Paper text:
Para-hydroxybenzoate hydroxylase (PHBH) is a group A flavoprotein monooxygenase that hydroxylates p-hydroxybenzoate to protocatechuate (PCA). Among proteins in this clade, Xylophilus ampelinus PobA (XaPobA) preferred PCA as a substrate and is the first known natural PCA 5-hydroxylase (PCAH). The overall structure of XaPobA comprised a homodimer, with each unit binding an oxidized form of FAD in its active site. The XaPobA monomer consisted of FAD-(amino acids 1–73, 88–198, and 267–391)- and substrate (amino acids 74–87 and 199–266)- binding domains.
In contrast, XaPobA replaced the Thr347 residue with Cys347, which has a side chain that does not interact with Thr294. The kcat value for PCA was 20-fold lower for the XaPobA C347T mutant that mimicked PaPobA, and 2-fold higher for pHBA, compared with WT XaPobA. Pre-steady state FAD reduction by the C347T mutant in the presence of PCA proceeded at a 30-fold lower rate (kred = 6.5 ± 0.7 × 10−1 s−1) than WT XaPobA. These results indicated that Cys347 is involved in the ability of XaPobA to discriminate PCA. We also determined the ligand-free crystal structure of the C347T mutant at a resolution of 2.06 Å. The Thr347 residue formed a hydrogen bond with Thr294 and fixed the peptide bond in a conformation similar to those of XaPobA + PCA and PaPobA. Taken together, these results indicated that Cys/Thr347, located distal to the active center, plays a role in fine-tuning the position of the Thr294-Gly295 region that fits PCA to the hydrophobic cavity, and regulates the substrate preference of PobA.
Residue numbers in the entry:
A (entry chain A), B (entry chain B): 1 to 391
Write the structure that this text describes.
């Protein structure tokens, strides 16, 4: 009930922070609203930036990703009826990404926290965060009709976009930047080995599509769809038909069809909240900012926030310096606004906007041509996709 | 009344083509709707790409660029209260730009067309163009209720955005891409020395402003204004006061004030029409495409179209090959869509859009931070501003 850092949310951001604080001897308690089996079994794809992989390695939780993490070097941007394999490994001078599912990361982080005796309260939704300028902050929650409270020097808000920590900021201090895109992603799993080994984007004018490897025998496929789209309106035949039209090009093998599983719709939205700290409250991850998943930046941005947050807390407790805590939001926001810039730039380029001005629509092809066909375009994509530096 | 290439419009595009075809022994006739002095002094500003400068020198009309012109190595992007000098000379690996106004270019091309006996009919608006799919094309012009006619092998549509050649293509051929921006430019000429040795862009949240330098004595200044702004609503002191607010930064010399001579409101519009040819008609310059002047691309695009058109025509009359004429629209539209992309990107970054989504508006600063603060950002701006390859 008394700790140094109270961590709201046992997602990737919260578990990584608790793991980093434990190895530094800083005490922390994680409070999660969902059941432990629900957090682990929440499946989601995962493209990790190199900085994220190095962060997991150096924290002693990179053994499994170094064992089976699939190194990723290129994206096949398909448009104009042709392939455009952008080798961002070459274009970034040796930096790359790793295909490693997010549910594997949390499983690795949950194992590290469990092995480290990190207290994690599950099925205990936080109801209030108070005392942000008091001697100690108070995390009010309830487990099963019984209310609880964690007292802590600092509250790390790692409770995601729909958590409570962002709303716990003072109203006169918080400011939001919100943009919802007029489309969603229809995601499926296909029981068929992928056609090509590269992550493949269909960026033609019939709509956005994406093809990636979920496993050696399962393909992950996305289709741009209406924002409020019912997955029942998409039969298997319609899905494969639209997937063929948006992805197939001459000179490349046709799409591998198979039984479709796990049909779902995900939203597309850019949101950022300022500041990311006030008093004893520090926001990180989706609690402070979300991006359209086009650039695979959300989890990597969360890990970047935690990297800065963990170091600042170590400087406070271990070295008696509070200036790094005071610059947490400042440094995280600089990187995150460039991440927001990159995720939006990809989203507005590869998706079809209903009723969009025809000149702006044609600029999408012009942006695709320049990004893939010029050294400057390939350079900017490579450095952003593999991960911007962390301050 | 009979020539080889009938040129519609005596702007920089039409004059440059008439001179180039004359240097190679090809006969041409220019038909201008306005007076001679009106065309010469229509626009008293302009920045030239390096490729445009070399083209003028190799054509024999670029001897005055060293004296009258102003060579550029950097632009001072001012925002957030600070200067950000982007040295596009170093970033592009040696390429640069020149401040050489359009009224100086036209005077040079008028001299060459005069010194080479190029027939130019002024105050004779072209009314109709026919025979594009016949063995010979006809240009029907008029003057005081008097119809004239000019027969030619090919028609060069260089009559600008308000011209008639773009509408001369058969029904269903032409397709237009049009996007208007919700602001205009209030441009002035001032008898005041430049406050800094570099062309300065004011990317303020009050609106865009620019300080260009005609000479060490005169300054060219632009202000973002309402699209149909009444220049009468902008007194001298209001202009200087707003220019101070959008340009002055601490630590840099303040803007100098002086007598204001030129003053006018110009629109901000992106337009491009496809194709740039049909049979014996060939469009060049503003007749086929206009951009917002944010990136100094209109004239340079017109000179890029003429360089391809003059080469294809010389290849036709000298070697009997129409292969380059058949690919004129193909190659010109390839470069122009990248030029449209760069002109739109700068325009949507540096101007304030009323009622804009807050996230998108804040991305303007993110785009400004990346363009000036990263090697990848500077490289892309440098190569684009100094001029893309023409091919
Ligand atoms: C389809 C898709 C694909 C993606 N692909 C990628 C990719 O390739 N690469 C990448 O880097 N990112 C990717 N992302 C983004 C990434 O998944 C998210 O950014 C990431 O989940 C953020 O983690 P987080 O810990 O900050 O938030 P979350 O993962 O949402 O964790 C928040 C946790 O807090 C808990 N919680 C909520 N409210 C409370 C409360 N009141 N009290 C207590 N606990 C609470 C939640 O139950 C949850 O466990 C993708 C996202 C989507 C949707
Ligand atoms: C404020 C401003 C700043 C600019 N700055 C730059 C810059 O820095 N760099 C740059 O490269 N560009 C710049 N531009 C763009 C540049 O001025 C134009 O793109 C350029 O004038 C295009 O040349 P053109 O010959 O194709 O068209 P025009 O210059 O418009 O020539 C067309 C000619 O045809 C004539 N004509 C029209 N209709 C007919 C008809 N029916 N019959 C006969 N004749 C006809 C017109 O009278 C005119 O003389 C700027 C433009 C503006 C408005
Ligand atoms: Ca108290």
């Amino acid at each position: 009930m008394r700790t140094q850092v109270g961590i709201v949310g046992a997602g990737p951001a919260g578990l990584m922070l608790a793991h980093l604080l434990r190895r530094e001897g800083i005490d922390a308690v994680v409070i999660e609203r969902a059941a432990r089996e629900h957090v682990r079994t929440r499946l989601r794809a995962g493209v990790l930036e190199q900085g994220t992989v190095e962060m997991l390695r150096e924290a002693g939780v990179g053994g499994r990703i170094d064992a089976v993490g699939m190194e990723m070097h290129a994206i096949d941007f398909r448009f104009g009826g042709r392939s455009h394999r952008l080798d961002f490994h070459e274009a970034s001078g040796g930096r790359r990404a790793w295909v490693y599912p997010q549910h594997e990361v949390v499983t690795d982080l949950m194992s590290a926290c469990d092995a480290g005796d990190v207290p994690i309260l599950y099925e205990a939704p936080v109801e209030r965060i108070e005392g942000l300028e008091d001697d100690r902050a108070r995390i009010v929650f309830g487990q099963d009709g019984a209310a609880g409270e964690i007292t802590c020097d600092f509250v790390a808000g790692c409770d995601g976009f729909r958590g409570v920590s962002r709303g716990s900021m003072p109203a006169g201090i918080a400011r939001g930047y919100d943009r919802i895109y007029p489309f969603g992603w229809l995601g499926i799993l296909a029981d068929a080995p992928p056609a090509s080994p590269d992550v493949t984007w269909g960026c033609s004018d019939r709509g956005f599509a994406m093809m990636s490897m979920r496993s050696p025998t399962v393909t992950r496929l996305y289709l741009q769809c209406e924002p409020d789209e019912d997955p029942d309106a998409w039969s298997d035949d319609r899905i494969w038909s639209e997937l063929h039209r948006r992805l197939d090009v001459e000179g490349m093998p046709s799409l591998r069809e198979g039984p479709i599983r796990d049909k779902g719709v995900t939203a597309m939205r850019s949101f950022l909240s300022e500041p990311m700290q006030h008093g004893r409250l520090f926001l990180a991850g989706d609690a402070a900012h979300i991006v359209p998943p086009t650039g695979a930046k959300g989890l990597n941005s969360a890990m970047a926030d935690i990297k800065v947050l963990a170091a600042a807390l170590v400087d406070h407790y271990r070295h008696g310096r509070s200036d790094r805590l005071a610059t947490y939001s400042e440094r995280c926001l600089r990187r995150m606004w460039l991440v927001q810039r990159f995720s939006a730039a990809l989203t507005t380029m590869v998706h079809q906007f209903p009723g969009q001005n025809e000149f702006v629509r044609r600029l999408q092809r012009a942006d695709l041509d320049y990004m893939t066909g010029t050294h400057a375009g390939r350079l900017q994509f490579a450095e952003n996709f593999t991960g911007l530096p962390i301050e």
